[PDB]
Nucleic acid binder design. Sequence first.
DNA 1: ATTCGCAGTTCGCG
DNA 2: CGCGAACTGCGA
Length: 756
Amino acid sequence: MILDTDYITEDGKPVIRIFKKENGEFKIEYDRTFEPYFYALLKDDSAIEEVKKITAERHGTVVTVKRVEKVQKKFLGRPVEVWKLYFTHPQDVPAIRDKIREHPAVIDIYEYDIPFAKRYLIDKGLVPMEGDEELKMLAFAIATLYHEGEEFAEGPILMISYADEEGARVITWKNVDLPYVDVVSTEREMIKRFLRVVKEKDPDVLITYNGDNFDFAYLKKRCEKLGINFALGRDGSEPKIQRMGDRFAVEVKGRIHFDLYPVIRRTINLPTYTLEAVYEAVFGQPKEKVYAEEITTAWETGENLERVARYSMEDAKVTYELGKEFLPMEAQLSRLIGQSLWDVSRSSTGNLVEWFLLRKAYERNELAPNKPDEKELARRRQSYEGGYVKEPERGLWENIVYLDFRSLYPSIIITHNVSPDTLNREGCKEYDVAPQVGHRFCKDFPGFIPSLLGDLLEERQKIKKKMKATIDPIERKLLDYRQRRIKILANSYYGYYGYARARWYCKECAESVTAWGREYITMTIKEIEEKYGFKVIYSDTDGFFATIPGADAETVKKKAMEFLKYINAKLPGALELEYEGFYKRGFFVTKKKYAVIDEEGKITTRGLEIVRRDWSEIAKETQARVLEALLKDGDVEKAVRIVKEVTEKLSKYEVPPEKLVIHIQITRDLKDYKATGPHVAVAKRLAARGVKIRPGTVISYIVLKGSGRIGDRAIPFDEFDPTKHKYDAEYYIENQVLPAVERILRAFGYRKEDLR
DNA sequence: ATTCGCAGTTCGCG
DNA sequence: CGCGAACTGCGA
């Protein structure tokens, strides 16, 4: 089982290292045969010997073209001939690719920015994380000394913790009366003990939470100041600190450093992303946190250090338990994308699609387009029109059926052959025309992406079917992840089409997909209304809520089935409308804001404030409470009662303070905010302290009773405490709880005045 | 660094 | 005072 790839240099020549685990034993494969290359396209074969003789310099050295071969390749389905420029060293490239391209007789250069190790996995057709192997894992966390006004590190590591299958233990250099804490003499001793256990345990996966930008990194500077060699790698190497854009990432060679924070952020939507918040969310088990002022105080006073060691032990524990929950999903994703878990787990949606397409492009001898240059990126600032949203029939409804297409946009892509290699292709026998936008798509042959999307969806149904048959627990659950992982990749293609940074960018493909979807949803709206007498309450992009006004639950149900049988006969290709569910009642505030109640009594919510993270827990809890009353019981007077109830508890300051917190993320440099909002103003003052504000940092603030703008009365909740602070009861009652619950009962004639 | 469509709050300008 | 720009996150 191939875990990762990289290369070392031996006598100036690159040596691929294939890190594997084969039947429980870590192994390293070496390849010195692989040669770095990129492609060049030129007007005449006359400049090739002129193109062989170009020279550059990387580091006092002189880089030359090792060899040349010219290959017949396809470009967007069209055949072409490019020169393959081999080189001595993987880094020979970047130094000389610009020089070759500025050559007037070269038209362009292709596939010049593929990392050697990743290029190796593609060209050699090797799949990472493919196999049945069980990986030994080890999670770890650290505790540190912090003075409010001081730079990074320089303030020792008080304790280091780790967890695995056997349990969780803490290492520290003071004495703590806890059975799971190992005591050593010094911080230097504590660090060295941690190096020994990792080597002793020899884990394939090192699980951290934000170790990329803190946990790991501290350890090095402390290791450097204390004269310690940080031999964490399987080849005795030190962790690799690398720069990933704004933030940083850490490698550990021979092992997979599995930082949960990036994978947790992309996978889940949480109001806050502290370790306790993620744990409470995933496992429903609460974890309390000891703040940094508490740990430094405790350490210097020698107060309950038991409390700090219990917290630090739980950090490692939940990190391991979270790592056990998310590694397989992330591992199967790597098998799909064909890249290392390390690279896959830190990759955005766009990178994952492109790494997949690049592997497939290589297989189909399809030369890969380049990433757009700066000016060519500017010509992609064009925008197009997307899904269709019907203005709802606002109010309360009964006997509501929901019908949507199965994977609308993927179905459109394969059915109509939506692809840049087929868009406006000439000389074909059969074409599909996209409505409104009018683009033609050749259909004589399968488009590059449509063929990939077809086999993807075909494979998923095969995994899904194999799933139910499998006797094995663990193969079955992994099969669930790969199948579900194929779903997310399959639905990423349309957005990829409109992504300006995509190699395979095609705005025409993007607006063609959206155009068909609008006609398919609207044509279906009219058919169900005109020929079956249904009433369509609400339709958003790929589905609609419909009812027959004066009908029984069984009548609307069975009639809806008959409509399905009828339009599916009229539905081309893989497009199919399905019966998603039936809901006894539903309430629709406006576009994107609605909720429904099924037969079970379970309530589904969309776009309402209960879903929002920038709305305090309390207006959501109240909005959920009223929503339940009329959806579950129909008791409108009970719904004004709970609002009445809540409103007086805010007025009397009985409501807990944590309910009143409102979490709003910072989306950019603070300097570039044209307007200053409450979360901005808060963030801005923390900036005027030791804390630094990173885009994507969540600010949790509370509004206090005071005079002025809401931004001038907001403090971070951590520094809020009732001794000197009285929260603003009126704002939460006037701007929060009522406005949310003053978007659904107006239809019942109620006004905020009826709820104070 | 997938896309567009969208409701609503906070703030500042006239 | 009304209104729109700025802003965030939602559904899909």
